[PDB]
Structure 1
């Protein structure tokens, strides 16, 4: 009663339970190990997957057949307007784990970030932080806020900033309620970290101050939801012969007689998609900052003046008007989903990681139908 012929198991037991994620925003489940000699930097952002397109670039990779040749590659655009830092949180090492010691918020919080604390903003009184705000206008109150900073400097082993997105600057997102997270400050001492975070309250962080060009980043987020799915698509098992009574799309035997139970290893039907995932080593091909030539889609080889947004806009997204980021390959989530960009935990040393990218062409033809023009005036002047 050994199986006659062997084949590897279908599906991975390492991503169980394959249930709906408990989170819409992706959760950073580990930050890069700290290096106190580095200056105080941040380690993550919240972006919005806008869409995909493709480049054509030319390779430099001696020994590869692609050397001195062209290549076409899919890329994903993530719109990443500046983050706004509203708070600071300190952590202390305890025998059970890490613990929040205290936290200080900024005086002025926008309506967007304050929407985060309500489940019906409109019919509330909008009182959140209306009394914590008064701590900034009395010398006894200022004394506390300053004293809380001293306590973080005195005992913290880890410092994080609270930041929210400027959700209002993406009109294609019909959202006013900003997304809020904690982003760890690496480098410098705890005294350096607290000064770096508080000094920079109520202000904006571009994506440039954290991520660079040609560096490898992890992308975190929740995958597309597909509802309740059977075993053939959910797990990838083979179909049964055509002439089976009661259906093809199942697993024929779900276990032996003993143990007299169904094991957790057998494939079952259930939720497919909307799962948390961390995806590593997505390379950065281009940083687009509003107000410089690096924002538009004009290379050194192609000078046709055009914007990154394809004709007719990114489908189901809108128009990318702010800072954005160009990643090699595909991105977790549907369009409009908030994604967590995180600095790599690993050391990047391989030749792919160090490789320098020079684009030659960015396709801005329409992603509806078979796009055939790169700009609208190209289209208009073609016809009439």
Structure 2
């Protein structure tokens, strides 16, 4: 017989299977459509989720109840030191999809990216790319031949970039290497840009700008094995239920004589790859810029780092991207920020945000002071010091 009362199904069938992502770095499965009249530029960037804070800004939204009024918004900080270009990959189109034809690497690779090719770095002989570096012996004839092949072919060009994880407070010490598509046409000059940027850093400000809507691609926080009640949001069974109530009561009708894929079952929760879109960049902050957390209204010479440091992350000493809201993944996790795949003109995008204040109070508790100077001013002289 029928359900006897309609209700929407629990969970989204388009995010199946609810399995662990194959890698801690979520893959970029679609790059922005190439506009071959633009200059050559990266379509994404690699950063590390540092943590969240809150900001205050004047809302510019005509017709809204809060137009020209102050709004408090949550923001996520992604530490984004410049990424080092170490290779270029050429992609030819085939009746069986895109196919990498060849990769040309830089002559010199730092130990940060060399660690990525080693499971046991400390006891290895560090031979990686030692014979490849000899391709640059006198004139780089083999390197130029491979680049000429990429120019003669490979309708799609991607660069190999790696993070400078040594510039982050993370203990990992092993860089993250990823392919970023080069948009801005003339495949010839795509390859030329890649080669000219070999071994050179690319700053996040050359990829992303203030107010730009971007997408965050990251592996979500893992939670291990989870029951149906929290994994899928199913109704808790009554207190009277024998054999447990954090379950799904009927996992299927008699026919089909099988548990169906669409029934909620207990299993892994989290550690899934997610591509969340339309996060507006609130700040493109620079690492060398003291008063990073300052605005034109605050003027307090303070960095973006909360007092006591970002909890479980550390201090932001590099360039950072501050996006509105939250993004998938937890602190210290590598996240790929990519340009939007379409042109958003909904007046939510195209809004020019101007921060009025950035919270730098401690996230290690109910933080009361933005700066140590403010703490001193409020508290006066203590016995230990200050």
What's the TM-score, normalizing by structure 1? 0.97
SS of alignment partner, residue 340 of structure 1: strand
Deviation at 1:144, TM superposition (A): 1.2
The answer to whether 1:356 aligns with 2:348 is no
User: What's the C-alpha RMSD, in Å, of the aligned pairs?
Assistant: 1.0
Quote the residue 1:268 is aligned against.
265
The answer to whether 1:315 aligns with 2:311 is yes
Deviation at 1:208, TM superposition (A): 0.8
The answer to whether 1:381 aligns with 2:377 is yes
**Any residues of structure 2 matched to 1:1-384 within 5 Å, and which?**
1-139=1-139, 142-170=140-168, 172-292=169-289, 296-383=292-379, 384=381
- Deviating above 2 A after TM superposition, structure 1's stretches of 4 or more consecutive aligned residues are 290-293, 380-383
Deviation at 1:244, TM superposition (A): 1.2
Deviation at 1:332, TM superposition (A): 1.1
Counterpart contact for 2:84–2:199, Cα < 8 Å: yes
For residues 36 and 290 of structure 1, what CA distance do their matches in structure 2 show? 32
SS of alignment partner, residue 100 of structure 2: strand
Deviation at 1:292, TM superposition (A): 3.5
Deviation at 1:346, TM superposition (A): 1.2
Counterpart contact for 2:313–2:332, Cα < 8 Å: yes
Deviation at 1:68, TM superposition (A): 1.4
Residue by residue, what CA displacement relative to the aligned partner does 1:292-345 show, whole Å, maximum 9, x if unpaired? 46x611111112221110110000000001100100001211110000101111
SS of alignment partner, residue 366 of structure 1: coil
Gaps of 5+ in 1: none
Deviation at 1:185, TM superposition (A): 0.3
For residues 68 and 109 of structure 1, what CA distance do their matches in structure 2 show? 51
**208-217 vs 283-292, which deviates more?**
283-292
Gaps of 5+ in 2: 382-386
SS of alignment partner, residue 191 of structure 1: helix
For residues 347 and 189 of structure 2, what CA distance do their matches in structure 1 show? 34
SS of alignment partner, residue 158 of structure 2: strand
Residue by residue, what CA displacement relative to the aligned partner does 1:187-246 show, whole Å, maximum 9, x if unpaired? 121111111111111101000111111010000010011111100000000011111111
Aligned residues: 380
For residues 149 and 4 of structure 2, what CA distance do their matches in structure 1 show? 67
For residues 91 and 241 of structure 1, what CA distance do their matches in structure 2 show? 57
Deviation at 1:381, TM superposition (A): 3.1
What's the TM-score, normalizing by structure 2? 0.97
Deviation at 1:382, TM superposition (A): 2.5
Counterpart contact for 2:288–2:318, Cα < 8 Å: no
For residues 382 and 195 of structure 1, what CA distance do their matches in structure 2 show? 57
